[PDB]
Ligand SMILES: CC(=O)O[C@H]1C(=O)[C@@]2(C)[C@H]([C@H](OC(=O)c3ccccc3)[C@]3(O)C[C@H](OC(=O)[C@H](O)[C@@H](NC(=O)c4ccccc4)c4ccccc4)C(C)=C1C3(C)C)[C@]1(OC(C)=O)CO[C@@H]1C[C@@H]2O
Ligand SMILES: Nc1nc2c(ncn2[C@@H]2O[C@H](COP(=O)(O)CP(=O)(O)OP(=O)(O)O)[C@@H](O)[C@H]2O)c(=O)[nH]1
């Protein structure tokens with residue numbers, strides 16, 4: 001039944017997911033224990049994609065919850081929806097990655113990697129025929145990158161023919177919260193290119209501007225910065241869980257939007273995004289939503305869509321609509337803004353319509369556009385990398401865990417070649 | 427897990443720790459007997475029932491001050507295996523405290539540590555408190571950190587040394603204690619501190635506004651600096667900075683490991699009602715020259731990497747807004763090739779202060795620990811004070827018969843000479 005198994009590697013990944021499993025449950029009527037209390041039967045027709053029915057009339061999350069420290073686990077258990085998780089899944093050490101890449105990739109997680117890898121093989125057999133690997137992590141610390149890159153290259157050994165979904169928050173120049181953020185990127189460039197099929201790129205920078213301005217809100221906490229990413233990841237997986245007129249599931253999106261073996265970095269998008277005040281001053285319809293979708297200030301990756309082209313956008317509509325109204329709005333924008341799209345690919349839009357909206361609206365959407373403006377986000381990290389390596393600064397925390405000079409020379413050429421492909425085909 | 431040990435070598439180290447353990451028993455709800463009428467596994471170990479003992483091995487070579495602990499209110503938390511007592515001290519001599527007298531009793535402290543070290547499984551690090559002007563904490567520790575480093579491999583070690591001022595200094599041969607302790611500063615401790623006696627006396631009368639600053643108020647302020655590194659082990663938070671996470675952000679090079687602390691809000695008892703002590707202010711308070719624990723100005727020396735460690739009612743949105751303003755500043759300048767120099771942790775607890783203390787009950791706090799380039803000019807104040815006493819060969823005759831020789835004195839000068847020279851090398855851009 002096209003199942004999806006879920007890994008969360010790192011504190012941000014363990015907190016994006018802890019609300020992602022909160023938002024995905026009230027779609028399906030899951031109580032805080034694990035039983036069904038929903039209303040529509042269309043929930044239970046495909047409930048078995050994120051769930052295993054355990055006996056007694058209960059359900060469990062197919063989720064494998066990875067840290068190297070017990071501190072984040074305690075927040076997971078004692079927080080919202082802790083009890084629903086299966087207590088065999090919490091595979092975690094006691095040491096700590098220390099915000100080192102090589103400690104989560106050569107030293108500490110490297111002797112816990114198999115004890116992760118056999119809770120997923122148990123979850124690989126509660127399913128009829130799986131397809132989904134949701135990995136939620138960072139590019140900021142140790143458990144996000146080094147524990148979240150060795151782990152993908154092990155799942156590729158078992159499954160050379162599934163689809164991989166990273167959800168990778170990126171480092172920004174404005175909000176730079178640690179000191180070695182440029183070292184937790186270029187090392188993880190090397191194996192999120194050639195071993196993942198899609199890679200959503202979310203930033204901490206642009207995700208505050210949505211909270212101050214578009215939502216008109218004064219206190220952006222992380223439980224709101226996550227709670228936007230939760231409602232994007234609750235949107236791409238809608239065709240696996242609900243019927244719709246023009247349906248498009250996870251491979252069907254990923255075959256239309258990815259024209260090349262490497263250019264598969266996406267940015268999300270979500271509409272409506274209104275305050276508690278500007279509710280009554282808005283009238284929900286397809287031109288209401290589609291114009292907000294294509295805004296320059298509704299891209300969570302902190303880049304300007306005006307500074308580049310899109311190659312292949314796609315929108316995933318939800319709610320009872322009419323097709324021509326959705327067809328003509330997508331017809332409108334390729335006519336209106338034909339300079340901002342690629343000239344050698346016709347019909348850039350792949351519509352997807354689901355008959356079920358998010359809970360308690362009239363409609364909603366989810367935007368994903370494989371733009372060219374991603375070429376700027378890596379230059380904001382490639383030049384932060386360029387200074388710190390040129391002095392060979394901070395090199396003694398990495399040579400002391402097994403790394404080498406050679407691992408830093410080749411990794412720049414990998415991030416060199418990536419921006420060398422958006423620009424060559426823009 | 428996550429446990430670490432305290433060693434209080436010297437009269438400086440004990441009386442600092444005499445309030446550092448006053449503070450922690452206050453924090454966790456622990457009466458001085460050991461009773462707690464969760465968190466405390468960083469410094470404690472619960473034994474039996476209703477008893478908590480610390481990781482407190484107090485080492486001394488003279489029985490005066492330790493007997494005060496054994497008759498003070500904190501005699502019951504500690505148990506009489508712990509308190510190593512000597513007979514007759516170094517008395518501000520090196521080669522007594524290292525080569526001669528401490529050779530007797532240092533076997534008694536190591537086999538007291540390992541009956542306390544192999545009881546915890548979550549060994550984090552060491553907190554060796556001493557000075558650079560004692561005779562106990564001067565060169566006896568230079569023997570002791572060449573014992574635990576042989577035993578414990580590459581574990582983290584943190585020394586918190588009191589450092590001599592140019593003007594206010596209360597001994598004579600203090601330009602001889604500091605040059606010889608450098609060989610166990612670059613080699614047997616990976617996060618080595620400097621705190622001045624001068625620079626805190628300016629704070630007790632201008633920020634706290636008290637006319638008589640003595641040692642029991644010079645030191646209660648250092649207890650709050652130690653209590654903020656360990657808010658991330660002992661407590662949770664939105665962002666947490668573990669004590670091995672701390673050093674990888676902070677320390678940029680294999681030998682430069684000299685941060686300097688500071689703290690805010692250091693304000694008076696009745697100046698609180700009017701000051702609007704906000705997140706944009708107390709972050710801005712960490713860059714005034716009148717909030718330095720070391721007598722040096724933050725302006726003539728450029729920063730390299732600070733590590734903001736907050737505590738209290740702080741959300742992370744405005745820490746970005748407070749650090750946005752400080753990056754727009756032009757006099758607060760960084761070395762250019764470290765384009766981000768910011769690391770932020772947050773505790774959820776309120777920072778607390780001692781009843782009968784001198785500080786004000788606030789609801790936010792910040793403890794910056796910056797690595798910078800200005801503090802190498804807090805060494806030329808003391809290389810000069812050494813430069814003339816050996817020039818006339820003064821005070822040599824107390825060391826020759828006690829073990830110390832001449833040829834190391836010319837040799838331990840390059841131990842400091844290259845060390846000032848290397849901040850000149852990595853402070854300049856290109
Ligand atoms: C009276 C009314 O219509 O209220 C709306 C509303 O005012 C607005 C402003 C909502 C509101 O959303 C937020 O303010 C919000 C806060 C944190 C993070 C993101 C959003 C709403 O809270 C959110 C809520 O969303 C849902 O009910 C969806 O099913 C949504 N659910 C959750 O995110 C969720 C929240 C808590 C607990 C469990 C689930 C969802 C979206 C996608 C996939 C699955 C679920 C809605 C429509 C409303 C309120 C209540 C005010 C908006 O968001 C959503 C997700 O719909 C923000 O912009 C939209 C437009 C809505 O009109
Ligand atoms: N949007 C969100 N960003 C977050 C959240 N938690 C942390 N972060 C951001 O992620 C970065 C910190 O990453 P982490 O705590 O995930 C590092 P991790 O725990 O994976 O490994 P360690 O190095 O072992 O700590 C930094 O940019 C934070 O500001 C969250 O809930 N939402």
Ligand SMILES: Nc1nc2c(ncn2[C@@H]2O[C@H](COP(=O)(O)OP(=O)(O)OP(=O)(O)O)[C@@H](O)[C@H]2O)c(=O)[nH]1
Nearest residue numbers: 436437438441515516517518559560561562563641
């Ligand atoms: N901040 C602070 N400094 C102190 C304190 N007690 C002593 N000092 C300083 O420490 C230095 C003197 O060293 P002591 O610690 O007394 O000497 P010692 O380590 O006991 O060595 P000997 O007595 O010579 O064996 C001087 O610079 C004093 O100002 C204290 O409680 N607080």
Ligand SMILES: [Mg+2]
Nearest residue numbers: 011097141143
């Ligand atoms: Mg972590």
Ligand SMILES: [Mg+2]
Nearest residue numbers: 437488515562
């Ligand atoms: Mg003494």
